[PDB]
């Protein structure tokens, strides 16, 4: 019911984390605490943490 | 430019998944050390991928310096101080730091 969008690439280096390009969208599977959430890809379904800040939603901008 | 990421805190796991990376890459292992290098690496760490640069540090006196963070697996060897970046996946399943100089924790 809540979905957010990559503003930026991002490339990992840990394994558990999710590598992505701008315009990729993400479903939330964990909004812990951590600012690295856990989310998937709806561009590649893969799951694995991202930083918070780099996905905006698909409500604002 | 892609903008700072959040602040996480190093874990075993990450520091290893780091250190598999950077030998895969080559690129570090076999450099020469120093000071503005290491902070090069360091800050691209912090920004890229959100890990306080605290973390890659080696134990002190002459001959090899021993990584303190358990899983980063680089240590720094003389080569004729004067030290070079060396790989060595030993140090993922010994704390050689820990061992030579358990004041530390």
Same mark, same amino acid.
């Given at each position: 019911?809540? *979905? /957010?969008? &990559? +503003?930026?690439?991002?490339? &990992?280096?840990?394994?558990?984390? +999710?590598? /992505?390009?701008?315009?990729?969208? /993400?479903?939330? *599977?964990?909004?812990? =605490?951590?600012? #690295? #959430? =856990? &989310?998937?890809? +709806?561009?590649?379904? =893969?799951?694995?943490?991202?930083?918070?800040?780099?996905?905006?939603?698909?409500?604002?901008? | 430019?892609?903008?700072?990421?959040?602040?996480?805190? !190093?874990?075993?796991?990450?520091?290893?998944?780091?250190?598999?990376?950077?030998?895969?890459? %080559?690129?570090?292992?076999?450099?020469?050390?120093?000071?503005?290098?290491?902070?090069?690496?360091?800050?691209?760490? @912090?920004?890229?991928?959100?890990?306080?640069?605290?973390?890659?540090? @080696?134990?002190?006196?002459?001959?090899?310096? @021993?990584?303190?963070?358990? %899983?980063?697996?680089?240590?720094?060897?003389?080569?004729?101080?004067?030290?070079?970046?060396?790989?060595?996946?030993?140090?993922?399943?010994?704390? !050689?730091?820990?061992?030579?100089?358990?004041?530390?924790?």
């Amino acid at each position: 019911v809540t *979905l /957010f969008v &990559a +503003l930026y690439d991002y490339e &990992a280096i840990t394994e558990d984390d +999710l590598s /992505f390009h701008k315009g990729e969208k /993400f479903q939330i *599977l964990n909004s812990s =605490e951590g600012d #690295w #959430w =856990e &989310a998937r890809s +709806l561009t590649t379904g =893969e799951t694995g943490y991202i930083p918070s800040n780099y996905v905006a939603p698909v409500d604002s901008i | 430019v892609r903008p700072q990421v959040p602040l996480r805190p !190093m874990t075993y796991k990450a520091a290893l998944d780091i250190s598999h990376f950077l030998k895969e890459k %080559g690129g570090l292992e076999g450099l020469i050390w120093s000071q503005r290098r290491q902070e090069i690496l360091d800050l691209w760490i @912090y920004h890229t991928q959100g890990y306080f640069p605290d973390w890659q540090n @080696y134990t002190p006196g002459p001959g090899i310096r @021993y990584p303190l963070t358990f %899983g980063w697996c680089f240590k720094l060897v003389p080569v004729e101080e004067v030290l070079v970046w060396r790989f060595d996946s030993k140090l993922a399943f010994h704390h !050689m730091a820990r061992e030579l100089h358990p004041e530390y924790y």
